[model samples]
Target: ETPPAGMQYLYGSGEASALSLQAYQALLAHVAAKVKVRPADSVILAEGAGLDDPRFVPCGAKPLAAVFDVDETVMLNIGYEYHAARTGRFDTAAWDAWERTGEAAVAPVPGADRMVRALRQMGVTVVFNTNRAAGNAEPTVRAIKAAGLGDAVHGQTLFLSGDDAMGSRKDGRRATIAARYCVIAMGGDQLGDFSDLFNGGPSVTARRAATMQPAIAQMWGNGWFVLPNPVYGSGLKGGFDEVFPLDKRWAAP
Candidate 1:
């Protein structure tokens, strides 16, 4: 049976693997440079910072850290996405169970394992900020370790949703991490993984434009590394008219 197109590309294709590796390689290079320079500010957007007037957390005496999002960023949830494909769409209960039980079934995102190791070698603490349920901390750690991405201690290195009062939003978590460690680099498949300011876009167009805005756009590879995640995410939205312009429509001859 055929899975969704995104699933085909994300889980089974060499192209996607190349993209993931490319991003990770670039991220490693950037992290290596930042590690040496020890910049004054982390890439994490500061509290009250907006896309237009972007601000970053100021690095003080905090140790260097490279923060990453789990799921498709560091680990691929192929087993669960496989189940979701056969079931029509995602089921909350299924996801919850998978989180708790699917450690061995996961794969490390291409280049992620090595990049993580390299970051650690550079003396940068490897941290994970994810939307995975806070209640499943143990399994999440097991999943990361099983994938060979290294260990993740909850609160100390792995910060999940429900860890804070804000629910699924991760800016609070990012802020907390940035406060403790100068976050030199952050990798994720979604915009919101970098900052909660990205969550405010009212429309696809608005959201799309917000990411490209001048000030924040500069963060793309500099410190904000984005992994390729076509399987499922906020990027999987927009309908016919929303995605294609009337002038760009085609008619079969």
Candidate 2:
């Protein structure tokens, strides 16, 4: 069957639907009520009485905040697929240039901006935790503003790739966000967002399996929120053309 114009087997592009959003909200409350959302500076808990459960007691009315990953998490990076289709594989330099100057008018994931604004209205400060290097900070921030997300993200809320170096591993960034505020929510498009959610880059099946685990699934919002992206990621990193001849892989034996 032909995939939808904006839909594909790709894991990167799915939007959180109303039911999905409700599920996420439920999971957030569940997790926040049980686990201590700890980082370096603060902790998080359910803010209001959750819709799913009225008896939930939130942690201190301490500062509530959230940290989101850019790229596939907030802004669409479909350009990565276009770039890869033109070249063949990941090209860091090309991607950097694209981030620096590309004005492709990336659309935000559905309900993402709305969600961020809602979080702000609830007195939650939003911080962006991205892997984009420090040097590209200007363009990256500009892209956030250009997407109509707003310019208020600067001054303090925005945090970038190298702010806490993990050398491409994003655990450090998550830890950084976990610091500062009582992180009521976290979102990203990759397993990396949950920090070691997978065993050092597992295959697609393994990653999916990880998400099904009670621990990971339960953290869907209070501690983690994952968007979708299927364009290009570790998921495409297998079935080598070198393993067998192209004819055998693509045609009948």
Candidate 3:
């Protein structure tokens, strides 16, 4: 007998779901290891987050800073994602309200709190680099603090999109930090958080190829710690049928 003809295995269960959990655990373990021996100078986790201009040099005397993305990088937005998935639409208004009231309060992703505390202990000023709209910064900071990562969520350190000249690409915000602090590391679930190489132009495969450059690839779990975010990411390509390919479902005996 042939098994059911559906895409259930690809997403509803099977490898897809398991891979997410596995990746999450792996990320935590790597985060723990990387921070143990991070250098005070000449050692940034995500090389892409900084300047490639040869003239630019980090002043060793500058303070240390760690940049991190907010949404899924620090706190879990499972509630919003579930709502979007169920309705097949992203309700921005509802999300905005949820954020404002703090009803969207969420648990810190596993190991996220530990990582933040560790960074703080090292005297590294933890900065939040989020794509959340500029107007939403207050609530965003509040929500993060409420989740128990408060020490890292404050007015001066929280940088949001639209807060500066660069609209959304984080390069501008990163530059701001690099001006005052030698960014030691960056953490986020999205590729954009680490580099502009994956921001625009080119297919997912092409962008991935760029990341494979020896210098960038070496930073993966080091100065550039990536948090697992299977819900959505640059790696997620194509539509449901394209990814799940109905024809590949299990065969019946």
Candidate 4:
């Protein structure tokens, strides 16, 4: 099949655009509020944190910032996806090439460009914590700029995978960003973008249930925002048995 149904929703549908716009609207408003009160703690999970009773890093008068995931949060990788669609499968080598030259094929997520600019003007530094290759940082910068989201200076406003030994895990990068700014808001398409803790749960069901916990549930739109991305990511994995619960499975009578 050419481009799964998920891609139809994520890259070619008005529904996804509306969802992204809605999320951005909420994020901008929430960050604006945080700017006034200036919370003493960041929204990032502190090192040695728990899911239900999580702790945040201390802001301590640092500048305010919003940490966002670049892919699917700030920009839509339409060009690269087109190539992936043609192949009908993922290839690391292809992705790397896309990373280097796909700058011309992306666009900012709905409302992201305006919100990002507004956040900068509002003095809430917009920081991106992405898993894009560290070697491709300059190309990634071109992508960000091409999408009209503006500049992303590596190691400053932008961070990539090769920045740390932790590999794809982002808690450390978030830690580093939190150290410099009061992260009043965050945005991404996956739970891992907010905290690596979301990645440790044993099963799909277990992982999802953790996010619903009372202590963790309140963060949605309050501080952590999500853009709609059904196309690709860690969120949608599993076979039929792994996805649908035994109790909920049914056939039409």
Provide the global lDDT of candidate 4 against the true structure: 0.88
TM-score of every model?
Answer: 0.96, 0.67, 0.73, 0.96
Off by over 4 Å in 2: 1-62, 78-80, 86-89, 152-155, 197-206, 221-223, 237-253
Instruction: Give the local distance difference test score of model 2.
Output: 0.57
User: lDDT per model, in order?
Assistant: 0.87, 0.57, 0.64, 0.88
Question: lDDT by residue for model 2 over 1-253, one digit each (tens)?
Answer: 4433333444232343443355345434533443444333232222332223322123344466766777767676555555555565667788888878864556655556666665655556777877777778888888887665655344367766666646667655555544445665667777666554364746655566666666445656545566655565554445575335477756567
Give the CA lDDT, 0 to 100, for residue 39 in model 1: 88
lDDT of 1 at 108: 93
Deviating ranges (above 4 Å) for candidate 3: 1-59, 152-155, 239-253
What is the Cα root-mean-square deviation between model 4 and the actual structure? 1.3
lDDT of 3 by residue, 1-253 (tens): 3222222332245464444454445544544454455444433333444323212225367776777888777777656665656666647797777667653547676656766776677677778888887887777877888767765443469888788877878877777777777776677778888766576776655666667777677777656767555556576676565565587777689
lDDT of 1 by residue, 30-128 (tens): 988887788888888888887779988998879989898898999999889888889887678888999999997999998989998988888989999
Best by lDDT: 4
The better-scoring model by lDDT among 1 and 3 is 1
In candidate 4 the C-alpha lDDT for residue 180 amounts to: 83
What is the C-alpha lDDT profile of model 4 across 101-214, one tens digit per residue? 999999999899999999999987889999999999999999999999988999999999989999999998998998888899999999899888878655787778888988
